[PDB]
């Protein structure tokens with residue numbers, strides 16, 4: 477049995493890795509991955525064109541890095557129709573020119589982009605700088621650190637496992653680059669920092685995994701619908717998602733009643749609000765990122781994380797779920813939902829990746 481303590485003071489999870497490795501890598505993976513190619517999930521809405529609101533740049537750019545960081549914006553004629561049906565259908569419900577257009581994630585896997593050096597380092601510094609809570613002055617929450625660190629790790633993991641290994645003037649080979657993984661993660665080479673960083677990825681992973689288990693209800697109500705064009709998979713996909721959320725629930729994970737997601741009024745609230753606040757800044761930050769694929773996955777993976785927390789805060793709010801009625805109390809836009817499973821999906825992939833790495837490193 478796993479066990480997570482998120483009091484805010486010292487936050488951590490005592491939990492066997494083989495347990496998660498085994499669970500995630502074999503129980504969950506092929507099916508989630510299946511779901512993430514589902515029509516409903518390959519297409520994410522995003523405004524990639526907002527300008528940086530904290531400084532200027534584009535100075536210097538390297539030429540191939542803009543070539544790697546460029547989002548393939550492509551979209552089939554049919555899909556083009558298909559999104560309106562969504563906008564439309566989606567309009568007629570809970571709904572509190574957006575140069576946000578839908579992007580195809582399968583056309584845009586997260587891998588090595590050549591994004592590096594000062595421009596990246598700055599963004600990271602600024603993201604971590606956002607760790608700042610009322611316990612009115614800043615306190616750092618360890619949770620935030622570990623969350624963000626886990627995310628950063630998942631990424632450096634993806635770029636590691638999905639590196640552009642060879643670029644003949646003809647052919648391009650993408651794959652696992654051990655030396656990178658190792659330079660960035662090996663315990664010795666990093667004086668134990670990498671392992672920590674990996675322990676942090678897992679933290680994140682579990683958080684999102686809990687966030688999923690605690691959100692199962694919202695999908696259980698048969699007025700909820702993964703609306704796309706057809707109805708068959710819309711239901712096939714519906715049960716899919718569900719048996720996944722069911723699997724997540726199966727996983728023996730427990731939290732200390734101490735967790736600052738407990739509704740101690742103002743504390744829980746202030747905190748929740750401190751959070752949603754911080755992630756908005758973060759999203760804003762992504763608007764200062766020139767690796768457009770990086771920027772995309774940034775937005776995505778963070779919205780997802782915010783959403784996860786949103787759930788993790790709405791313990792109660794969800795516990796009184798209109799089992800037949802439509803959920804006014806709590807809600808999730810398509811945008812958020814896509815981001816939720818997707819964010820979880822890259823962390824889920826990252827975890828998988830670590831195993832490949834173990835296996836190659838033998």
Ligand SMILES: Cc1cc2nc3c(=O)[nH]c(=O)nc-3n(C[C@H](O)[C@H](O)[C@H](O)COP(=O)(O)OP(=O)(O)OC[C@H]3O[C@@H](n4cnc5c(N)ncnc54)[C@H](O)[C@@H]3O)c2cc1C
Pocket residue numbers: 586587588589590591592593596597599600624625626627628629631632635673765769770771773774
């Ligand atoms: C939002 C975003 C998305 C990105 N997407 C991609 C991508 O898809 N492909 C790609 O190649 N690059 C991507 N990058 C750049 C990438 O994350 C690295 O910064 C880059 O590859 C350079 O590596 P580095 O070791 O010099 O920098 P980093 O690894 O980012 O180092 C920055 C500093 O923080 C420390 N650090 C590094 N990782 C962690 C961690 N997990 N927890 C705590 N501290 C850490 C480092 O040791 C160093 O002190 C992205 C960056 C951002 C900000």
